[PDB]
């Protein structure tokens with residue numbers, strides 16, 4: 001009896017990131033082929049994010065700290081890998097001097113602070129924050145770099161493990177409006193659904209359209225999955241993810257602006273935490289059996305090992 005788990009949720013919620021934590025913990029570690037692929041991604045992640053940051057402070061009018069940096073900004077503008085792939089260490093090292101200089105500019109860091117005014121996977125900060133060893137000539141990625149790297153899932157990927165002598169099989173699929181269209185192929189013979197939610201995204205708008213709120217979409221999707229006949233004999237467990245990023249936003253940006261019906265203290269983590277559980281609780285018609293849920297940080301490996309051992313129980317006991 002091989003347990004089939006399905007990883008669902010909106011775009012940029014941490015589905016793939018979770019699936020990585022599974023391989024690290026329960027699967028076989030990555031051979032150079034995959035490792036180099038992760039690096040290409042990391043390099044790319046760093047180059048595309050900066051391009052956006054350099055264009056951000058321009059399109060928002062923010063001035064430079066040191067106006068010399070213009071010329072560093074120039075060096076990134078014409079970078080492009082849209083629908084492209086391998087980005088080699090030689091390529092990247094040319095940009096290291098530019099990247100470090102720009103990142104030091106307070107004008108740019110301020111542009112990163114107004115991130116939510118546009119589209120940028122904040123995973124950029126971590127890399128530029130330790131560009132010093134990424135930008136070293138003989139660099140290989142760490143586990144933590146890898147987990148923080150980002151590639152948009154444009155397909156489906158089964159991933160097999162045997163945890164405590166029980167054969168698991170997890171499927172990762174894409175979360176964007178375009179990709180959802182594929183989901184129905186994976187609904188076959190699933191024993192559970194791990195629904196994920198980028199809980200830090202109350203102030204952000206969805207990428208694939210300028211206007212729809214990211215967290216509302218998550219709720220909208222959850223409502224449709226959780227109340228489905230097809231998934232009547234299926235365990236459904238909710239992962240409020242990016243808890244470590246959430247902590248940060250809570251301090252500076254308020255959810256009150258975006259969710260006016262919120263009635264608590266907008267700068268207390270738990271006031272906000274409980275509200276989220278409730279919102280997702282509320283989209284369920286069968287609020288009789290309780291809402292299995294966790295507050296995860298999918299980049300933090302221990303958190304996940306802990307959290308998954310619990311999830312393994314919930315599922316198997318049902």
Ligand SMILES: Nc1nc2c(ncn2[C@@H]2O[C@H](COP(=O)(O)OP(=O)(O)O)[C@@H](O)[C@H]2O)c(=O)[nH]1
Nearest residue numbers: 012013014015016017123148150242297298299
């Ligand atoms: N800080 C933080 N970042 C996360 C977490 N989970 C995922 N990420 C980042 O979010 C980005 C999107 O992850 P991914 O798994 O590809 O999202 P997906 O589209 O749902 O598969 C990656 O760059 C990850 O580094 C988390 O718990 N905390």
Ligand code: ALF
Nearest residue numbers: 011012152153175
């Ligand atoms: F939901 Al994705 F890449 F955005 F798996």
Ligand SMILES: [Mg+2]
Nearest residue numbers: 015016152153
């Ligand atoms: Mg993905």
